[PDB]
Amino acid sequence: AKDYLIDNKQAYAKIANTLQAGDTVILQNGVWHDFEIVLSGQGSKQLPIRLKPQTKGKVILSGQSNLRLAGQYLHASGLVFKNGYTPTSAVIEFRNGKELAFNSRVSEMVIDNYNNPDKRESDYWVALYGQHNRFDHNHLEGKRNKGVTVAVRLNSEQSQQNYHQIDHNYFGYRPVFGSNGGETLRIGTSHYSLSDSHTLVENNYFEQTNGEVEIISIKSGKNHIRNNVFYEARGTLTLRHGNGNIIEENIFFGNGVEHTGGIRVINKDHIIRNNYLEGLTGFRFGSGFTVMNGVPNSPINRYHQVENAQIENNTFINVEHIQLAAGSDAERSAVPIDSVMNNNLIINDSQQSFTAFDDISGIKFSNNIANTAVLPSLSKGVKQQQVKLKRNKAGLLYPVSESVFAGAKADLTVLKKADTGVSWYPKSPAIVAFDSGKTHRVENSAKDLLLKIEQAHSGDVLELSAGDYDLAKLVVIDKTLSFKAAQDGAVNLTFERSSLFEIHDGGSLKLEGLVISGKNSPDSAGNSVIRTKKWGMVENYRLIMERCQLIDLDINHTFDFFKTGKGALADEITLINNQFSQVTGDILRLDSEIENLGVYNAEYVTLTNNHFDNVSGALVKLYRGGTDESTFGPHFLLKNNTLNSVGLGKRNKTNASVYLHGVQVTEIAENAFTNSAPIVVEHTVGEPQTRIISNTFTNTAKPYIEELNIAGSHTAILKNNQVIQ
């Protein structure tokens, strides 16, 4: 057995096929392009076959590179995957075709934004096959395309009963995906969900894993999830399919962040104990704790009745929603049975949680303690009592009184973020913050403006001097940038191309105090002031505009203010205290996802204190089609705005000043609609939360609300609105 220092791919190929126990392959420092590594051979427990770098952190794999393991007692470690994407189904794969890896290990890997350029082209970053493999001390962040980040596969007997160990990994940022398929960890699939996987998932740190409602999707039997930390993670740990899973000693720090969930319970024989859940704001199936209703004789890929669930000795601090018998309907009529809830501590500094949606007499309650009037009908199983808490040195709240025998065990440990991932690669912020950089004064000229844009760094601010800026070119925004007027109302912008700003990957845009006119824009349909890349967007973006005036967007028809590209997704679009006048198109066109697969173009949309005058199109066309219930948004807020002659354009097929199809949270308050088209809400699935309050409708038809997946009356809240004809 020998050490092989490998300096190029052909040198690797010369030896890759004859590796023997004890061999170690050392990749020379640098960037390797289009390197499809296969580590294979018959190692032994005393003499494994090793692959490692010359220097940890200096071997980068880019382009269409990946890694495959096949054989026994193999250990790959220390590689960095960035600036590329796998040309196969996975970046790291514990197999080589039909040949699987056993008793093998992958550690100290970094995969950082190693994304397929097509968000709809699905892939895994890590795919486990075989048995008795380990995936530890790795660092994964920034997966943006369809497909779970880490998948334990069970599509053969030699991949089931694996007892894989997934420990001490840093599962970093995953942005909101805006679609199903954004999980971080999946154990099995429905087809193989009746097999036992026995996968151990321990001591991992999940931070802002916000892909979708399922952070972890367990779809197999007898797995063990313990001592993991979920920090401001939007989603839940869902026992989706399979029976006999053990969830214990996990820690959820929501910090009141929106849509932070906990544990959802489906299927049979699960044990949920000694978990600590704090500050979780998610609701419905993304709630802090859910026990679902099942389907009688359920198909394998639907919902199986909860039976023999043992939920004991858990602590719930300011968890806003606990739901039992959830999802009850004509299909999901099977209520939980033969289950128990014991020794749980439920403390809500405020007052919110706990709701039953069906018969819950199949859940026996004992020695549960709460500070609110949680369960008055289950009187003897839940006791109301004021519990004063003290946060210990580990960061956990415990009762100050030693006579409170409820909640998680006293010695519960808390995994440290610094004990996961690797010490030689930084754990950096998910996003570049607006205005976090330097401010550059810009001369009154389009040339100097374009120059300062080109030379600015992400997070910088461009303070424009007074005067005109007549752009002849498209302004690309591929970094986080803010544009601000030295003095409000003293800066005018015009543009000759079909658009002024085009937001690319990495771009985020903030505008303040500007006047923008389309008076020099092309005499053609389809103009816009701001747009994303028409196709192929990968990174979520932010758009903020405050105290701006947009005028004369009317040289031709279909002159929008903002137009989404296909597949694009905004983390937020925020328009505060702006003036829009004389627009032939729409203001916010977020309606490109016509396939009705559950894809949408904006997570948060917020319009406040604006004035809209003579807009032929709608304020917003926000569309999410289909019957998917895996996501949180879109969210729409419209408050304290004024609309005059909005939405009556002959070309506005929605016939609405505000068109909301599939939007999941809607707040329309304290607006004035005058001589405008009405609000049109089209509710789909997921029991959307729509609220229309204290608005005035002068010469404007009352809101129209339609249920497309539910019978009878609509579920929106309409309160204190005035219709004046």
In degrees and rounded to multiples of 5, residue 552 shows phi and psi of 55, 45
| Phi–psi pair at 284, nearest 5 degrees | 50, -135
Nearer to Cl ion, 193 or 293 (CB): 193
Query: Min. distance of Cβ 49 from Cl ion in angstroms?
Result: 27
Report the alpha-carbon distance of residue 536 to residue 569 in Å, rounded: 11
Q: How far is the CB of 540 from Cl ion (least distance, A)?
A: 29
The least distance separating Cl ion from the CB of residue 181, rounded to whole angstroms, comes to 15
Cβ proximity to Cl ion, 124 vs 398, nearer residue: 124
Contacts with Cl ion by CB under 5 A: the residue count is: 6
Whichever of 144 and 219 has its CB closer to Cl ion, that residue is 219
Asked whether position 127 contacts Cl ion by CB under 5 A, the answer is no
Nearer to Cl ion, 156 or 582 (CB): 156
Asked if 154 touches Cl ion (CB under 5 A), the answer is: yes
Cβ count near 147 (within 10 Å): 22
546-to-293, 305, 467, 512 alpha-carbon distances in Å: 46, 51, 19, 5
Q: How far apart are CA 43 and CA 19, in angstroms?
A: 9
Q: For the chain, count helices (H), then strands (E).
A: 2, 74
CA distance 382 to 376: 8
Cβ closer to Cl ion: 150 or 280? Answer: 150
Nearest-approach distance from CB 188 to Cl ion, in angstroms: 5
Q: Per-residue contact track with Cl ion, 37 to 56, x per CB under 5 A? A: --------------------
Smallest separation, CB 131 to Cl ion (Å): 14
Q: Tokens for 496?
A: 């000759």
Q: How far is the CB of 220 from Cl ion (least distance, A)?
A: 8
Query: Is residue 189 within the footprint of Cl ion (CB under 5 A)?
Result: yes
Closest CA to 511 of 469, 539, 564: 469
Cβ partners under 8 Å of residue 240, min gap 6: 193, 214, 217, 218, 219, 264, 266, 267
Judged by CB, which is closer to Cl ion: 175, or 188? Answer: 188
214 closest CA partner among 267, 271, 282: 282
Contact at 8 Å (CB) between 574 and 544?
yes
CA neighbours within 13 Å on the CB side: how many for 315?
25
Cβ 64 to Cl ion shortest distance, Å = 25
User: Using CB atoms within 10 A of its CB, is residue 423 exposed (0-12), middle (13-18) or buried (19+)?
Assistant: exposed
Select from 22-30, 152-160, 294-302, 356-364 the region that touches Cl ion (CB under 5 A): 152-160
Q: Which residues, 360 to 379, sit near Cl ion by CB under 5 A?
A: none
Please choose, out of 55-63, 182-190, 196-204, 653-661, the segment that lies near Cl ion by the rule CB under 5 A. 182-190
Nearer to Cl ion, 154 or 375 (CB): 154
In this complex, which beta carbon is closest to Cl ion, that of residue 129 or of residue 398?
129
Question: Which listed range, 192-200, 240-248, 562-570, 703-711, lies at the site for Cl ion (CB under 5 A)?
Answer: 192-200
Of 196 and 502, which has the nearer Cβ to Cl ion? Answer: 196
- Tell me which stretch binds Cl ion (CB under 5 A): 149-157, 258-266, 637-645, 667-675: 149-157
Among 52, 137, 146, 153, binds Cl ion (CB under 5 A): 153
Q: How far is the CB of 155 from Cl ion (least distance, A)?
A: 5
User: Min. distance of Cβ 373 from Cl ion in angstroms?
Assistant: 44
Stretch that binds Cl ion, among 37-45, 67-75, 187-195, 440-448 (CB under 5 A): 187-195
Which amino acid appears at position 658 of this protein? V
Single-letter code of the amino acid located at 505: D
Both structure tokens of 10: 């052909």
Q: Which one of the spans 68-76, 146-154, 437-445, 570-578 is the region binding Cl ion (CB under 5 A)?
A: 146-154
- Region near Cl ion per CB under 5 A, out of 113-121, 133-141, 150-158, 236-244: 150-158
CB of 191 to Cl ion, least distance (A): 7
Rounded alpha-carbon distances, angstroms, from residue 575 to 4, 24, 546, 567, 588:
59, 57, 6, 22, 10
Least distance from Cl ion to the Cβ atom of residue 200, Å = 17
Helix (H), strand (E) at residue 10: helix 9-16
Interface region with Cl ion, contact rule CB under 5 A, candidates 83-91, 109-117, 148-156, 498-506 = 148-156
For position 317 contacting Cl ion by CB under 5 A, the verdict is no
Helix (H, G, I), strand (E, B) or coil at 664: coil
Half-sphere exposure of 409 (CA within 13 A, CB side): 11
Please report whether residue 195 would count as binding Cl ion according to CB under 5 A: no
Closer of 155 and 487 to Cl ion (Cβ): 155
Taking contact as CB under 5 A, which single stretch among the options 85-93, 153-161, 233-241, 498-506 is the one that binds Cl ion?
A: 153-161
In the complex with Cl ion, the residue whose CB is nearer, 79 or 154, is: 154
Provide the b/e sequence for 209-239 (b: ≥16 CB within 10 Å). Answer: bbbbbbbbbbbbbbbbbbbbbbbbbbbbbbb
| Closest C-alpha among 257, 262, 252, 338 to residue 294 | 338
The contact set with Cl ion (CB under 5 A) reads 153-155, 188-189, 192
